[PDB]
Design an enzyme around this catalytic site. Structure first.
Site, PDB file in Angstrom:
ATOM      1  N   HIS A  12       2.214   9.034   0.902  1.00 14.66           N
ATOM      2  CA  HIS A  12       1.078   8.789   0.028  1.00 14.66           C
ATOM      3  C   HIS A  12       1.414   9.705  -1.136  1.00 14.66           C
ATOM      4  O   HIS A  12       1.774  10.864  -0.924  1.00 14.66           O
ATOM      5  CB  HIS A  12      -0.227   9.233   0.685  1.00 14.66           C
ATOM      6  CG  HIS A  12      -0.577   8.447   1.906  1.00 14.66           C
ATOM      7  ND1 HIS A  12      -1.276   7.260   1.855  1.00 14.66           N
ATOM      8  CD2 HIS A  12      -0.286   8.656   3.212  1.00 14.66           C
ATOM      9  CE1 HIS A  12      -1.400   6.772   3.077  1.00 14.66           C
ATOM     10  NE2 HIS A  12      -0.808   7.602   3.918  1.00 14.66           N
TER      11      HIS A  12
ATOM     12  N   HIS B  28       5.706   6.952   6.531  1.00 14.17           N
ATOM     13  CA  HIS B  28       5.460   6.499   5.172  1.00 14.17           C
ATOM     14  C   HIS B  28       4.932   7.690   4.400  1.00 14.17           C
ATOM     15  O   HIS B  28       4.784   8.776   4.961  1.00 14.17           O
ATOM     16  CB  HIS B  28       4.414   5.381   5.153  1.00 14.17           C
ATOM     17  CG  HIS B  28       3.118   5.759   5.800  1.00 14.17           C
ATOM     18  ND1 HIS B  28       2.900   5.639   7.156  1.00 14.17           N
ATOM     19  CD2 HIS B  28       1.979   6.273   5.280  1.00 14.17           C
ATOM     20  CE1 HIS B  28       1.681   6.059   7.442  1.00 14.17           C
ATOM     21  NE2 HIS B  28       1.100   6.449   6.322  1.00 14.17           N
TER      22      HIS B  28
ATOM     23  N   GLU C 149      -3.206  13.438   0.947  1.00 13.54           N
ATOM     24  CA  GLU C 149      -4.485  12.995   1.473  1.00 13.54           C
ATOM     25  C   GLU C 149      -5.218  14.222   1.996  1.00 13.54           C
ATOM     26  O   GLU C 149      -6.363  14.473   1.623  1.00 13.54           O
ATOM     27  CB  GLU C 149      -4.264  11.948   2.564  1.00 13.54           C
ATOM     28  CG  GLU C 149      -3.569  10.714   2.006  1.00 13.54           C
ATOM     29  CD  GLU C 149      -3.850   9.465   2.799  1.00 13.54           C
ATOM     30  OE1 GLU C 149      -3.530   9.440   4.003  1.00 13.54           O
ATOM     31  OE2 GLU C 149      -4.393   8.503   2.210  1.00 13.54           O
TER      32      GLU C 149
ATOM     33  N   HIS D  65       0.855  -1.197   0.000  1.00 11.95           N
ATOM     34  CA  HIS D  65       0.000   0.000   0.000  1.00 11.95           C
ATOM     35  C   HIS D  65       0.882   1.236   0.000  1.00 11.95           C
ATOM     36  O   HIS D  65       0.489   2.300  -0.473  1.00 11.95           O
ATOM     37  CB  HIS D  65      -0.861   0.015   1.254  1.00 11.95           C
ATOM     38  CG  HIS D  65      -1.225  -1.351   1.730  1.00 11.95           C
ATOM     39  ND1 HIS D  65      -1.521  -1.627   3.045  1.00 11.95           N
ATOM     40  CD2 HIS D  65      -1.326  -2.522   1.061  1.00 11.95           C
ATOM     41  CE1 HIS D  65      -1.788  -2.916   3.159  1.00 11.95           C
ATOM     42  NE2 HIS D  65      -1.676  -3.477   1.971  1.00 11.95           N
TER      43      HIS D  65
ATOM     44  N   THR E 276      -5.885   6.682   7.912  1.00 11.32           N
ATOM     45  CA  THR E 276      -6.449   6.890   6.573  1.00 11.32           C
ATOM     46  C   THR E 276      -6.516   5.637   5.707  1.00 11.32           C
ATOM     47  O   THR E 276      -6.906   5.700   4.539  1.00 11.32           O
ATOM     48  CB  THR E 276      -5.683   7.965   5.804  1.00 11.32           C
ATOM     49  OG1 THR E 276      -4.352   7.509   5.553  1.00 11.32           O
ATOM     50  CG2 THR E 276      -5.640   9.267   6.603  1.00 11.32           C
TER      51      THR E 276
ATOM     52  N   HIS F  25       3.728  10.876   6.434  1.00 13.64           N
ATOM     53  CA  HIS F  25       3.058  10.605   7.697  1.00 13.64           C
ATOM     54  C   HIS F  25       4.011   9.971   8.695  1.00 13.64           C
ATOM     55  O   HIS F  25       4.484   8.857   8.485  1.00 13.64           O
ATOM     56  CB  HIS F  25       1.863   9.675   7.476  1.00 13.64           C
ATOM     57  CG  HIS F  25       0.692  10.340   6.821  1.00 13.64           C
ATOM     58  ND1 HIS F  25      -0.357   9.633   6.275  1.00 13.64           N
ATOM     59  CD2 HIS F  25       0.397  11.650   6.639  1.00 13.64           C
ATOM     60  CE1 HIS F  25      -1.248  10.476   5.785  1.00 13.64           C
ATOM     61  NE2 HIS F  25      -0.813  11.706   5.993  1.00 13.64           N
TER      62      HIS F  25
HETATM   63  C1  LIG Z   1      -2.583  -1.928  12.694  1.00  7.67           C
HETATM   64  C2  LIG Z   1      -2.051  -1.625  11.343  1.00  7.67           C
HETATM   65  O1  LIG Z   1      -1.270  -0.403  11.434  1.00  7.67           O
HETATM   66  C3  LIG Z   1      -1.705   0.720  10.742  1.00  7.67           C
HETATM   67  C4  LIG Z   1      -2.884   0.688   9.952  1.00  7.67           C
HETATM   68  C5  LIG Z   1      -3.337   1.822   9.253  1.00  7.67           C
HETATM   69  C6  LIG Z   1      -2.572   3.034   9.346  1.00  7.67           C
HETATM   70  N1  LIG Z   1      -2.895   4.231   8.723  1.00  7.67           N
HETATM   71  C7  LIG Z   1      -1.990   5.108   9.035  1.00  7.67           C
HETATM   72  S1  LIG Z   1      -2.043   6.795   8.453  1.00  7.67           S
HETATM   73  N2  LIG Z   1      -2.090   6.778   6.858  1.00  7.67           N
HETATM   74  O2  LIG Z   1      -0.807   7.403   8.891  1.00  7.67           O
HETATM   75  O3  LIG Z   1      -3.294   7.313   8.944  1.00  7.67           O
HETATM   76  S2  LIG Z   1      -0.690   4.624  10.068  1.00  7.67           S
HETATM   77  C8  LIG Z   1      -1.388   3.054  10.140  1.00  7.67           C
HETATM   78  C9  LIG Z   1      -0.944   1.915  10.833  1.00  7.67           C
HETATM   79 ZN   LIG Z   2      -0.546   7.626   5.892  1.00  9.09          ZN
END
Ligand SMILES: CCOc1ccc2nc(S(N)(=O)=O)sc2c1
Ligand SMILES: [Zn+2]
Ligand SMILES: [Cl-]
Length: 258
Positions: free
Chosen positions: A94, A92, A104, A62, A196, A117
């Site tokens: 996007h 990470h 985003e 992703h 997100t 992020h």
């Molecule tokens: C438990 C699985 O870990 C996760 C899952 C979704 C997720 N989304 C973000 S974000 N795009 O920074 O809002 S950090 C994150 C960590």
């Molecule tokens: Zn993110």
């Protein structure tokens, strides 16, 4: 199946497996600069990444995560709208298929080329898994990326992407200093939101910096060479892995400035 960013498994489909997708505090959101209000109750924001310890970089299908050792209080975020201490666990990005889209969050509907992020969890919950069961369990620092001059501090990341082209691939990534990804100003907007991507949990206090960082076209183009697919599978370029703005609903975005 599996959620993704395609036509048949994209953001508009997530609500089926993750009903919270139509929740009351979903992210991202459009930041209307004129409606955001300066909040004097906000304390100075403190980003302490001097002792940060990166360990690995991973293509999770992703996006790609630069993971850190969070077994001790090192890279921490505090102050601002936050109560207590939040520990950096990973960061990470996007991004889009074109420079005109990719972020985003949006500012007055403007989409940036990408968004960084930096994810942190509230240390009073013991660990990340427990933090995501709390309304104030996480804090994500968001930074916009625009295409222009190269960002020196990002090159180490772009140069390792060739080794984690496909889903499931990871590579050692030690001694990376996230301080090299921060802009000069820490002015920001903040509001209560969610993750997100699925599970889209509503445990996040969002802190989005006003000043974007500049990255070169060459750097973002390499982001676009990554794959959503696994090795040996038909190539599906990892681009446009962003969720669009969600309903603000009963929320107010606060500004840390003017
Ligand atoms: C438990 C699985 O870990 C996760 C899952 C979704 C997720 N989304 C973000 S974000 N795009 O920074 O809002 S950090 C994150 C960590
Ligand atoms: Zn993110
Ligand atoms: Cl596609």
């Amino acid at each position: 199946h599996h959620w993704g960013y395609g036509k048949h498994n994209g953001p508009e489909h997530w609500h089926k497996d993750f009903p919270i997708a139509k929740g009351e505090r979903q992210s991202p959101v459009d930041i209307d600069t004129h409606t955001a209000k300066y909040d004097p109750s906000l304390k100075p924001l403190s980003v302490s990444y001097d002792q940060a310890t990166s360990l690995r970089i991973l293509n999770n299908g992703h996006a790609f995560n630069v993971e850190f050792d969070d077994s001790q209080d090192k890279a921490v975020l505090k102050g601002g709208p936050l109560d207590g201490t939040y520990r950096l666990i990973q960061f990470h990005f996007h991004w889009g298929s074109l420079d005109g889209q990719g972020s985003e969050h949006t500012v007055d509907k403007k989409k940036y080329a990408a968004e960084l992020h930096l994810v942190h969890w509230n240390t009073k919950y013991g660990d990340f898994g427990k933090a995501v069961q709390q309304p104030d369990g996480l804090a994500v620092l968001g930074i916009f990326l625009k295409v222009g001059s190269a960002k020196p501090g990002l090159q180490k990341v772009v140069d390792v992407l060739d080794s984690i082209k496909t889903k499931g691939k990871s590579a050692d990534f030690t001694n990376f200093d996230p301080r090299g990804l921060l802009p000069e100003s820490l002015d920001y907007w903040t509001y209560p939101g969610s993750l997100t991507t699925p599970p889209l949990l509503e445990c996040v206090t969002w802190i989005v910096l006003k000043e974007p960082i500049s990255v070169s076209s060459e750097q973002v183009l390499k982001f676009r060479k990554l794959n959503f697919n696994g090795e040996g599978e038909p190539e599906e370029l990892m681009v446009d892995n962003w969720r669009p703005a969600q309903p603000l609903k009963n929320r107010q975005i606060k500004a840390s400035f003017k």
